[PDB]
Ligand binder design. Structure first.
Ligand code: UQI
Length: 107
């Protein structure tokens, strides 16, 4: 599944809803601690819309429980991410993913 551990609190009241655009910065790492991808490296916040099947399940479920402003660590099992195949070249097979996610804005 996905575990959400708060790093720093959000507003405690404004949570993502279907149809809203979620704006984040994230860093993704393997259990080894090695980074596989970061929006901060690209100088560009990552945006997705909730309920449009745009992201892995662990994101859909994990970010939905964050409030605006919150920074959290999401630990995501392979079955809530890229599963047995992974994504060759980027995400290894059967990988547990750990993301540092900061919910910057809802728009
Ligand atoms: C590039 C941004 C997304 C990519 N996706 C959706 C997605 C889109 C196309 C292919 C694989 N996965 C995602 O579901 C997740 C979670 C949100 C932040 C990023 N990833 S990601 N960091 O695991 C990632 C995974 C992969 Cl296979 C490629 C890249 Cl460029 C990024």
């Amino acid at each position: 599944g996905v575990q959400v551990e708060t790093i720093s609190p959000g507003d405690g009241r404004t949570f993502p809803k279907r149809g809203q655009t979620v704006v984040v910065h994230y860093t993704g790492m393997l259990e080894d601690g090695k980074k596989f991808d970061s929006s901060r490296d690209r100088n560009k916040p990552f945006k997705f819309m909730l309920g449009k099947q745009e992201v892995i399940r662990g994101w859909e479920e994990g970010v939905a429980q964050m409030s605006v402003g919150q920074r959290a660590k999401l630990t995501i099992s392979p079955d809530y991410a890229y599963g047995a195949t992974g994504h060759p070249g980027i995400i290894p097979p059967h990988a547990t993913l750990v993301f540092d996610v900061e919910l910057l804005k809802l728009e």
